[PDB]
Amino acid sequence: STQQLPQTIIIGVRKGGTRALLEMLSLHPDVAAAENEVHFFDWEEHYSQGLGWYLTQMPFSSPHQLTVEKTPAYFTSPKVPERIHSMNPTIRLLLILRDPSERVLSDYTQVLYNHLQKHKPYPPIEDLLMRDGRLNLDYKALNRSLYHAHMLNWLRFFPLGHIHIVDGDRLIRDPFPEIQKVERFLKLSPQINASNFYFNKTKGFYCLRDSGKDRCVDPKLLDKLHEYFHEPNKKFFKLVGRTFDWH
Amino acid sequence: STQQLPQTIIIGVRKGGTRALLEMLSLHPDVAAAENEVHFFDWEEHYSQGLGWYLTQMPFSSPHQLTVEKTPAYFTSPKVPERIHSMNPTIRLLLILRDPSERVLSDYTQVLYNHLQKHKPYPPIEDLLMRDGRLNLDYKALNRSLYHAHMLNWLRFFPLGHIHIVDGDRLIRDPFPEIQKVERFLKLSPQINASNFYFNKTKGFYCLRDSGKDRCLHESKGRAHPQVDPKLLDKLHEYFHEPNKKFFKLVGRTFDWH
Amino acid sequence: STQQLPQTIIIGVRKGGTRALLEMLSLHPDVAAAENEVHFFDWEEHYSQGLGWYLTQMPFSSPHQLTVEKTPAYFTSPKVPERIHSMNPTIRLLLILRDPSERVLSDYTQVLYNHLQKHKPYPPIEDLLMRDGRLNLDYKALNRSLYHAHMLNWLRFFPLGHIHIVDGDRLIRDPFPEIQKVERFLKLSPQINASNFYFNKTKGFYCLRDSGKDRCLHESKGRAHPQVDPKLLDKLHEYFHEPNKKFFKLVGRTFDWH
Numbered sequence: 001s002t003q004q005l006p007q008t009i010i011i012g013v014r015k016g017g018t019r020a021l022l023e024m025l026s027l028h029p030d031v032a033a034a035e036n037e038v039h040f041f042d043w044e045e046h047y048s049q050g051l052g053w054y055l056t057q058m059p060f061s062s063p064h065q066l067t068v069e070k071t072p073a074y075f076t077s078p079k080v081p082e083r084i085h086s087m088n089p090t091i092r093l094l095l096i097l098r099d100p101s102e103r104v105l106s107d108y109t110q111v112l113y114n115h116l117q118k119h120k121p122y123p124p125i126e127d128l129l130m131r132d133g134r135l136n137l138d139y140k141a142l143n144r145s146l147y148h149a150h151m152l153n154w155l156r157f158f159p160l161g162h163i164h165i166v167d168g169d170r171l172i173r174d175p176f177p178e179i180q181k182v183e184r185f186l187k188l189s190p191q192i193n194a195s196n197f198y199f200n201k202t203k204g205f206y207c208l209r210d211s212g213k214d215r216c217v218d219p220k221l222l223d224k225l226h227e228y229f230h231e232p233n234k235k236f237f238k239l240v241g242r243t244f245d246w247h
Numbered sequence: 248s249t250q251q252l253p254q255t256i257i258i259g260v261r262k263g264g265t266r267a268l269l270e271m272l273s274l275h276p277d278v279a280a281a282e283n284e285v286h287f288f289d290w291e292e293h294y295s296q297g298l299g300w301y302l303t304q305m306p307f308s309s310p311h312q313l314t315v316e317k318t319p320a321y322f323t324s325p326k327v328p329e330r331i332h333s334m335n336p337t338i339r340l341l342l343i344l345r346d347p348s349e350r351v352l353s354d355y356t357q358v359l360y361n362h363l364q365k366h367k368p369y370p371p372i373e374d375l376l377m378r379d380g381r382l383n384l385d386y387k388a389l390n391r392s393l394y395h396a397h398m399l400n401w402l403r404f405f406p407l408g409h410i411h412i413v414d415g416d417r418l419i420r421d422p423f424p425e426i427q428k429v430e431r432f433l434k435l436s437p438q439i440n441a442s443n444f445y446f447n448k449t450k451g452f453y454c455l456r457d458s459g460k461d462r463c464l465h466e467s468k469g470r471a472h473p474q475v476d477p478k479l480l481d482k483l484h485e486y487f488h489e490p491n492k493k494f495f496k497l498v499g500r501t502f503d504w505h
Numbered sequence: 506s507t508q509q510l511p512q513t514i515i516i517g518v519r520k521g522g523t524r525a526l527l528e529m530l531s532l533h534p535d536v537a538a539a540e541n542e543v544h545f546f547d548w549e550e551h552y553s554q555g556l557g558w559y560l561t562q563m564p565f566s567s568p569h570q571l572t573v574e575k576t577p578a579y580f581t582s583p584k585v586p587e588r589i590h591s592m593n594p595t596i597r598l599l600l601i602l603r604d605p606s607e608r609v610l611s612d613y614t615q616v617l618y619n620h621l622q623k624h625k626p627y628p629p630i631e632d633l634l635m636r637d638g639r640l641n642l643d644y645k646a647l648n649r650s651l652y653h654a655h656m657l658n659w660l661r662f663f664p665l666g667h668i669h670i671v672d673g674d675r676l677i678r679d680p681f682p683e684i685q686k687v688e689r690f691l692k693l694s695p696q697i698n699a700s701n702f703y704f705n706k707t708k709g710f711y712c713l714r715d716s717g718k719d720r721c722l723h724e725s726k727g728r729a730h731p732q733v734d735p736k737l738l739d740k741l742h743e744y745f746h747e748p749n750k751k752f753f754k755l756v757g758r759t760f761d762w763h
């Protein structure tokens with residue numbers, strides 16, 4: 001009954017379905033997860049405190065359990081790859097991605113909802129995007145969808161095969177299959193069953209069942225998004241070695 | 248865009264996969280489907296209101312469309328065939344069937360579930376199937392799987408060629424091929440595609456892909472059957488063997504049943 | 506961890522689906538199975554080496570395990586029964602049979618395939634089956650389907666109750682129920698679940714799921730049938746009709762064979 005340093009960490013992408021990927025894996029009894037995003041390897045105020053601080057945040061695990069921590073930001077912070085690698089160059093990493101365009105929209109919707117939860121002002125999406133008839137390359141959200149670029153920063157410290165790429169779109173539509181691939185990757189016993197997931201009409205997404213608990217734009221523009229990522233995607237498919245059904 | 252009487256009707260059988268059939272057929276742009284079971288011909292309180300009432304229950308449609316409706320109870324209601332015949336003797340009917348035994352366990356499961364969500368108790372399926380050491384021939388489920396006996400009633404008013412039998416077992420394993428046969432039968436154009444379906448391992452069945460959106464049938468469609476002692480399943484398969492043999496001869500085609 | 510003589514043997518029939526029966530039974534953790542066909546009791550070159558040789562061919566097993574061996578040729582080899590009986594008159598035997606006609610066709614497809622994997626030529630099945638207007642009783646494949654004739658050789662040394670007959674056709678259509686009957690017969694704990702089997706569209710047969718593995722039988726299992734003239738297939742059914750009736754009588758139970 002102790003606290004151990006993370007056997008595995010979910011590194012992103014932001015708005016790729018990380019909250020769910022965690023919650024699902026959490027179902028496995030051989031898994032203990034850190035309730036909240038820790039932000040260790042990305043925030044100086046946190047990375048300075050050292051690994052000891054990092055462990056203070058972990059949850060209480062059993063010898064036969066493996067600890068997990070989720071922090072979406074890691075994937076898009078160039079300084080985090082090397083650091084973690086210095087903590088364990090053999091550690092195993094989970095990267096959940098979804099259609100680049102969809103991801104962008106999810107991001108904006110996030111930021112918008114945050115500002116409005118503070119009587120603070122934010123521009124309409126079309127405003128952060130379009131700039132003189134073309135895509136405003138200054139929009140942070142768009143950068144976070146250039147998966148190819150951010151991958152390189154992880155391949156330089158990690159082997160393609162130590163970073164499992166979960167299909168985000170598929171996890172929304174058909175969870176179980178993807179969670180199975182994850183169990184196998186982390187070498188856990190197939191303890192999760194299709195029965196652990198069930199679609200909820202009012203929610204619009206799958207929800208979970210563990211023990212006895214039951215818990216949960218202008219088309220012409222969207223097109224420009226697709227056309228913009230088309231190329232960058234091709235590069236990604238190639239860098240990782242497998243395609244995805246992105247527009 | 249107006250309300251029109253159905254040119255086609257899914258008449259059963261109960262638990263044969265009527266919802267799936269209705270939703271997949273619904274994918275066709277030239278098809279307008281009633282969202283719920285109407286129970287027009289089989290309930291006196293409804294039939295007594297006349298064709299007029301029936302018409303107001305249909306979805307609204309464009310002139311070029313074919314309206315569809317589904318009431319699984321129709322198949323085994325003796326009085327229905329003649330009533331549908333009076334409305335339109337030329338109508339084309341859809342009947343989806345699957346293994347007689349499978350259908351029984353499927354019928355049982357639903358009734359069990361309905362009782363549960365109503366905090367009421369219901370026995371295990373073997374108490375209903377067997378009693379005093381004998382196969383209980385009074386269990387309605389069994390009677391609903393005697394296809395030949397119910398079919399004869401329909402054949403008194405409609406040509407076998409106007410009753411397309413959908414292979415429910417096959418629909419479960421590979422939808423498209425069966426849905427294609429439905430398209431030709433209803434003289435609809437080849438609009439539906441293989442890409443309109445995809446297997447879903449979390450669900451355990453195929454799901455649909457219309458527009459770009461995705462969907463699976465509700466939680467009530469595709470429940471898990473109960474474990475039944477082989478010896479019991481054996482008595483079931485034997486009970487339907489001869490009746491199945493009459494059915495194949497009557498409709499001129501065999502089905503891969505137990 | 507040691508090597509033990511077989512507590513049970515799958516004796517045949519050839520092409521009745523012995524590989525499938527062995528692989529499925531292997532899922533049970535309390536079972537150790539010999540990878541390949543041993544051919545102990547039927548080949549002099551082997552039987553002459555004694556039980557020590559037989560033991561040396563078995564796989565390693567735990568005390569709480571039972572060893573199984575598969576040699577489809579045993580069933581149709583006259584000298585075998587007495588020999589096995591000498592080793593252990595109380596041993597339990599597994600016999601898997603499917604429609605005699607289907608079996609004959611699988612047998613032919615088997616020999617055809619083999620010939621082509623050696624550039625050697627082989628005629629179409631019709632050439633082998635017909636001879637002067639009737640079935641060619643010199644075609645070995647036909648003889649191997651005369652279950653009654655071969656069964657007598659086994660009942661002369663073993664009690665009917667010690668020879669479990671697995672329905673080959675049913676194993677193909679719905680495995681689990683038959684595998685359950687086998688477990689019970691061999692007195693094993695019901696450790697196999699329906700979830701261990703799943704139908705595979707591309708394959709055309711059920712496949713297995715144990716632990717986290719997903720596998721189907723090799724390319725040699727489930728080969729494409731030779732399109733046969735219906736009038737010929739009929740002659741086959743009529744040929745086995747009487748012999749089947751005798752078999753059903755001898756073993757005390759019928760099978761759905763044409």
Ligand SMILES: Nc1ncnc2c1ncn2[C@@H]1O[C@H](COP(=O)(O)O)[C@@H](OP(=O)(O)O)[C@H]1O
Pocket residue numbers: 013014015016017018019020072106109171172205206207
């Ligand atoms: N089972 C699930 N329930 C809810 N959202 C899920 C989900 N599986 C995947 N997601 C996706 O995960 C996104 C959230 O990303 P993250 O958790 O990484 O911030 C959601 O986007 P929305 O924000 O548009 O709902 C949704 O698209």
Ligand SMILES: Nc1ncnc2c1ncn2[C@@H]1O[C@H](COP(=O)(O)O)[C@@H](OP(=O)(O)O)[C@H]1O
Pocket residue numbers: 260261262263264265266267319352353354356418419452453454464467468469470471
């Ligand atoms: N794609 C699909 N998804 C869910 N159920 C489907 C389906 N295709 C066929 N079915 C069958 O439809 C049955 C219910 O039929 P109906 O709509 O006529 O009540 C289900 O029985 P189970 O729920 O017993 O498995 C299931 O076998």
Ligand SMILES: Nc1ncnc2c1ncn2[C@@H]1O[C@H](COP(=O)(O)O)[C@@H](OP(=O)(O)O)[C@H]1O
Pocket residue numbers: 518519520521522523524525577610611612614676677710711712722725726727728729
């Ligand atoms: N799940 C399965 N996969 C493949 N073949 C199976 C099977 N279950 C039964 N069989 C049958 O087993 C036969 C082979 O028998 P055996 O292993 O004794 O030689 C195959 O003959 P075919 O290849 O002619 O179809 C096939 O019909």
